[PDB]
Design a protein around this nucleic acid. Structure first.
Lengths: 99, 50
RNA sequence: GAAGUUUUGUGAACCUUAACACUUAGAGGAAGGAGAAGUCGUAACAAGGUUUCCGUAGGUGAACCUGCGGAAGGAUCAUU
RNA sequence: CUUUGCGUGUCUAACGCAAGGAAGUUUGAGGCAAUAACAGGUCUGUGAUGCCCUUAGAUGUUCUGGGCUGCACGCGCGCUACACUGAUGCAUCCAACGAGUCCUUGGCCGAUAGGUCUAGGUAAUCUUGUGAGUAUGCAUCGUGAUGGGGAUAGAUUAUUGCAAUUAUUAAUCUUCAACGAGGAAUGCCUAGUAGGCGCAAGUCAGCACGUUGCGCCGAUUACGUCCCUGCCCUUUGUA
RNA sequence: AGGUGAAAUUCUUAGAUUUGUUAAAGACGAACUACUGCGAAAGCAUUUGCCAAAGAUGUUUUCAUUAAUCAAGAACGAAAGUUAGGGGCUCGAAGACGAUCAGAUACCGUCGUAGUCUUAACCAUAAACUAUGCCGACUAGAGAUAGGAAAACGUCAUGACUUCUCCUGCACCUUAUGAGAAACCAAAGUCUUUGGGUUCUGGGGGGAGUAUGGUCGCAAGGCUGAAACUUAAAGGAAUUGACGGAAGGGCACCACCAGGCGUGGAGCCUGCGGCUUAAUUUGACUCAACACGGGGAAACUCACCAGGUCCAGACAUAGGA
RNA sequence: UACUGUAAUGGACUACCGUGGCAGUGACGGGUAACGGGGAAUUAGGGUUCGAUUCCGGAGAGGGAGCCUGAGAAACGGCUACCACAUCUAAGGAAGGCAGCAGGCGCGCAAAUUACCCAAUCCUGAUUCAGGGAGGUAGUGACAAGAAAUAACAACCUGGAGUGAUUGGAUGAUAGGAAUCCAAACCCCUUUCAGAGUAACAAUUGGAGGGCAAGUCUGGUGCCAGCAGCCGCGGUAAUUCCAGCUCCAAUAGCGUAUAUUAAAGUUGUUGCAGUUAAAAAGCUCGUAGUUGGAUUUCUGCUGGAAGGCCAAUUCUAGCAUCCUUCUGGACUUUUACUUUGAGAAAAUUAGAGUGUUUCAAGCAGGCUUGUCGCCUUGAAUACUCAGCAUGGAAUAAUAAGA
C-alpha cells in the first residue's frame, strides 16, 4: 500500500529532478526528497562570545554568522533525530514546528 | 516415496479383530409399508444413545 | 473375324535420391521437483544489525557482494 | 490534615524547602490481593478422584537385617578461617521472642560430662529478673603458618534408646594438614537498615554447621539514573 | 600529516600537511531551487548570439468534416554495455594490500585499470511509476500557483503591486445518499437502476520468461514462447497480540551508579548430577530445579533390596462338614 | 482465338498468343481420437458440447489401377493385372474377397442365435401363382424408457391417533389346463383346478466429524493396519480404521471410473477483471480495421372505413398550391432495417383431438338389432443465416454537389 499519497519526493510534472549528495551519509538522493535544514548560526556559541566582546579591537563588532545548507538522506536524518517518525493521522501536517 | 517399505504387516487388523455373528431378528417392512412407519414415529435427534 | 503385331494414351507395382512427419537408443553434460532428519554459513522479514528493490555490468564456496542510473513497495507526506 | 511560613503550577491537581512537633517518604514494617493465563509443580498431604495395573508364588500388610550416609570427579545454599581493632587467662556488668504434665531451681558426689536425694510449676505466681555473646578492665604472647587455623586420626568416660558398628551426641588427653584475603564470573542491601554477635522456638527418644522469629553493638555511601539486566504505557515496522 | 568506532597500509626534514600568488588541465554548474516551469516520453538549470520548432492566450480572419482510436509498419528511447577515433580532472565494478571477525573474497580505510566526458555508429531494456491506456460528455465548492487576456477616476513610478472575472497548466485542502475488499479515490464517480467510441493485456501457485524453433543483434542479450511433472493453497487490505540492536514517556538496589559485606579460592557440613551397587526408593532442572518436598533418614518412617509371615479376600451361589 | 474430346458446357485436352489469378476479411501448408445435414444432451435468456448409428445426400467393398455388357456401373455376392494375405494340388495347375445374415479367431474396458417364415411391409420378374438373411417373428439382454408386489384389516399396553410375532378370519409370484394370439410355436389380455402366516415367497446398495441427512453408543487396534473426492481421523480413553447394535438417504435399483453439460458473471455479445490481488505496450507517428457533430414537408382542419368499450387504438382519402406516359406500372438515388407473403420432405421437437386399464406410447377411434351403417370421421397447426417478392414517413450507410 501507499504509505504516502505524495511518495515523499514531492515531484509533479517532471520525470527527472536534480540530485544532491547527503552531507553525512554520502548517498545520492533526489534534491526534492533530500530533507533540508538551512542552519544559520553564529560562530562562537552564545556563552563564549562575550570573551570576543571583551578582548577585541573596535567599539562594538557584529560577530559574522556562519551560513550552510545541510542536506540529508532520510536514513541519516532518522538516525540523527532531525525528523524521527510520526503517526498515520499526524503525518499529513506540513507546517513549520519552530517558526 | 521410498520403494522398500515392507509388506509383512498387510492385513493386520482384519486378521486381529474378534469375529461375531449377526443376530437373528424379525424382518423390517419394505417399500410403501416402510414409509408408513417412518411417517408415524416422527410426528407422534432421531438416534439418542445413553 | 481369331492368334500375333505397330504406335499412342490410361497406368498399377517396384527401386534410387531427397525432404517432411511421427515414434526411439545414446557414453557424458546439466535442469526442476520430491524425500525426512545431514554438512556449511546468514540473505530476507525490526533501521533484520551495511534500508529494501529495479535495470545493467564485473567478481566470489554458497546464499550473495560492489560500480553507475532509477523507485518508494522507506526508516521522511514537514522548517530561510 | 502534609497544619503554619516562603518558593514552585492554567497557581487547578499537587511537589520542594525551612520552622514547629513524639512522629511529616501514604509516619515505619507486614497481612489481604483482580482479570487472563502457563499443557509450571503436587495422584508420594488426604476417605479429592476417572482410567489402567495387580490382588495371595502380592506392588496389600508386617517382622528380622541392610540401604537412602555407598566415591576417579563436576555444580548450588551455608559454617569456621587466615590473625595483634587479634587469640588466650582472669575479673566487671546488660537484653528481647518463646516454651513446659515435660521445664528445672535447692543440697551433697564428680576435673569434666553427668548422676543422686528433696523441691516449685497447669504457669505476669515456678524454672527466670532465663546474670546471652560481640563489649569493658587487668595480665601474658610477638609476627613466626606461631599460642592464628582446628580438619584428619588413636585411646578413654558418661548420656538417649529395645539396638549406636558405616562411629547419634557431649566430654578428657593427644594427633597439628589445607588456608597469607581468594582467577574469570556473579549475589544481597538505603537507618536501628547492612554487617557482626548471641538467644529462643519448628522438626525431636537422641542429633543444627539448616529455617522461622527475637533482641544487642551499630557504620560507609546515594536521595539520582535509564548505560547494562528486566518491567509498564503510547506512536511505529513485521513475511 | 592522513584516516577511523579504534588503528594500520600510505605520505614525510632530498621539507609533507597547512600559508600566498599564479599557470595548465578536464569535469561539474552550488546558494537562489519551490508539493514552480518546459518537453511525446527518455529528459532539460552559467553568459551571449545565430538557426528553425511548440503550447496557451487573443481574434465580428480562413478552409468546411478534413475527425477519434489504432493489427501490420516506422521514429525517439536514462544508466550500464559494445565498436572506432579523441580526452582522461575527480570518482571508481575488477585487482591490490591494511583493518574488523571464529572466518570476511563484504561493510570501514588507502591506492587503482575498464568506465565516467565527447564525435561517429550500435544496443532497445529500468520500481522507463501516477505501479492508474487514449479521445468525449457531465457531476463541488474554498484558497493558493504558472502563462495569456479584459476591467478599475485603484496605490506607488511601457513595468511593479492591490481588487475582481475569464479560459489553459502542474497540484493541494475539505466533503460526499458517489465508488471500493479495504488502504484510499474529483477519479478508482455517473456499472445488476449493468451498452458514448476504441487499442493492448490477464484467468490458482510453481515448472518458466526456462526448453525447442523462429527472427533482430558485432556480442551482451531483445521480441515471440511451450510441455512433461508438481502443488492446496500462493496473493491483497486492514485487526489484535508478541517481538525490534526504531522513536517519545515514566519506573526497581530481585538493575547499574556511589559504596558496604560477600560467594567463587581453602578445608568442612549439606542438596543435586553422575560413577558405583543385591539396593544405593523418587520427584523438581534459567529467573520460577539444587539446607526444596517443613526431607536434621540407626530400626520405625520406607516408597528400595535379600528373606520370612498374616488375610485383616465384604457379600452372593456351591461343595464339604 | 481456333481445333479436339464429351451425353453436352468448360484448360476438360492440344496448338499458337497475352501475363495474369489468389492472399492480413488468414491464401498456401499442418492437425483432427472429422463423412455432411435433418437432429441429440443441457431445466431463465444468451450459450457450450455431441451427431459411427432409424431419414436424405456422399464415399467404399483388403490396397491401388484398368475394362466389358447395358437405359444406367469405372460394378466387386462381374472380369483382367500388380502388390499384400491365403486355399486345394496327383506339384502340371486351379480357384478366393462376410465394412450382407448368423458363427469363429484376434484386438481390446467394450457388444447376442451357425434359430423359424415370406403371414405383415415393400421390391424384382415373362408376373393374381415364383423368389427375397430386404423385412418380420422368437432366443440372449439390469445399454436404456414406462407401470408398480414385498402386505391390509380386526378384536384383545402409552392415552393424549400410534405400538404389541397375542391369537383371528377375510390377491398374483408360482405350476398345469381352456380358449385367444401366432405362418408355426411363445408372450400379453380373459377364465380356470391347486397356490403365504415368523406372508422362509425373508431388499438390497451406500453412509452416520464437517461439507451432506444420521450415533459426545459398545468391543478390538495403538501415526500400526487402514480410511480419506477436499478439510482431516489413527502416537492406549478413535463422534472417521476393523466389527456389532441402532438410525439416516435412495429403492428394484444403488455405488464406482472416464468424457461431457449446468454450477462458471472461473472465457463474460447479453456479462467479468487490469493503482496495490493475475494483468495498461517506455513514448509518439501510422495503414487497413472499428466508430464518427448539427442540418433538408413539419404542423392544422374536414371526411371515410373499421373498432374495442361501457369517443380511445388502428388504417386511409382530401384541402393549404402535390408527378405524370396510359386504362393496373413507369418515375421518387441505391441497399440495409422492419412488416406481410411465396417456396421450402418427413421422422424428431412443441402442439390440437382421443380413458393404449394408467403411463412411456400409438394415430387411432366413437355411436348403434342395423345389412348400399352413420359421424358428407379424424390424423389440425407451428417450426425449416443466404436467396426471391412487397407495404413503410424513422434510424444508418450510399449516391450527387435542367
Amino acid at each position: 500500500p501507499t504509505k504516502r499519497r505524495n511518495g515523499g519526493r514531492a515531484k509533479h510534472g517532471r520525470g527527472h529532478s536534480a540530485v544532491v549528495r547527503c552531507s553525512n551519509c554520502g548517498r545520492s538522493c533526489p534534491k526534492d526528497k533530500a530533507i533540508k535544514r538551512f542552519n544559520v548560526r553564529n560562530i562562537v556559541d552564545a556563552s563564549s562570545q562575550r570573551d570576543l566582546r571583551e578582548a577585541s579591537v573596535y567599539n562594538t563588532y557584529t560577530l559574522p554568522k556562519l551560513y550552510i545548507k545541510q542536506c540529508y538522506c532520510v536514513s541519516c536524518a532518522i538516525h540523527s533525530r532531525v525528523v524521527r517518525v510520526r503517526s498515520v493521522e499526524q503525518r499529513k501536517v506540513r507546517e513549520n514546528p519552530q517558526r | 516415496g521410498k520403494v522398500h517399505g515392507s509388506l509383512a504387516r498387510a492385513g493386520k487388523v482384519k486378521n486381529q479383530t474378534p469375529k461375531v455373528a449377526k443376530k437373528e431378528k424379525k424382518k423390517p417392512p419394505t417399500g410403501r409399508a416402510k414409509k408408513r412407519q417412518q411417517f408415524n414415529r416422527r410426528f407422534t435427534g432421531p438416534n439418542a444413545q445413553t
